[PDB]
Amino acid sequence: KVTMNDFDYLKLLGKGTFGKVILVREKATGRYYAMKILRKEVIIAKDEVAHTVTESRVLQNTRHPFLTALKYAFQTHDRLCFVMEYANGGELFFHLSRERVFTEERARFYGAEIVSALEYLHSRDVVYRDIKLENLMLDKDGHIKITDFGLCKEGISDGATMKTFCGTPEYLAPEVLEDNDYGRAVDWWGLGVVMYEMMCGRLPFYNQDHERLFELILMEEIRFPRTLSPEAKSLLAGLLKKDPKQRLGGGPSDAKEVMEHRFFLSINWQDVVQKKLLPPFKPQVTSEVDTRYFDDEFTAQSITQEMFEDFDYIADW
């Protein structure tokens, strides 16, 4: 059994709409974890029960190097708690904000790790749906780690479909902005939005008013820097093809289509999953408690039912 007092509570890594994430140390071992802490009544009152449990179930049934691993999930009479492996290098967002743009090669690297991750997830019949720079963390070695699995849909193989309107306004795919249903190819639209950002240094489409944002997604053609490569242009246009069926990764091959694109010609897809390639950047952290890749905004601050049936967890590893 796992309680709150198995942990020392070092500092805040970040906040979301229903909780917060803290770096903690397992009292009995000296090991470090990012722990996500949410309040039951808030989740109850905002009908966020389904998502919270899916997040658990999906973390309980997925094992991949470029996905955040769950060590413990427990609850107390008033809270839900995910003890996740700690990603020492913060968000890809932090790094892209700081640097403005990545080289194609560095973008290719993180691209391939995301494609390996999505391929896996698709093979486990789950669609992620919320690819964005904020959800792509870096581990201590500099490998992608996908986080936040609450909007996943499970039980989606081959060409099955989903109905719910969800995601992140700026990264929603055209088909999600039309009525009714959509397939797993939305994740290739998401990939496409982060590859664009990573290589072009902005979002492909943006407006602060959602009505104008959605207009652009459905109806504006993307633009490229003149000095983006023929093959980077080609990837981006493919991944950001508005019709999911014409989209690179939208056929029945799914990930295969993307992996086979000339932008990734230098990638050995087996080397990718086994982490045999030197990453283009290593988080230069001095200690286990060093949070230099999380915004000071968050790191500066202080430390204060059959419904939840499939939530609890202990990892064999």
């Binding site: 904020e134 909007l151 995601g167 306004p169 700026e170 950002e197």
Partner: peptide, 10 residues
């Protein structure tokens, strides 16, 4: 700089 984004579900 790009502002932080927020996930939703309807």
């Amino acid at each position: 700089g790009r502002p932080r984004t927020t996930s939703f579900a309807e």
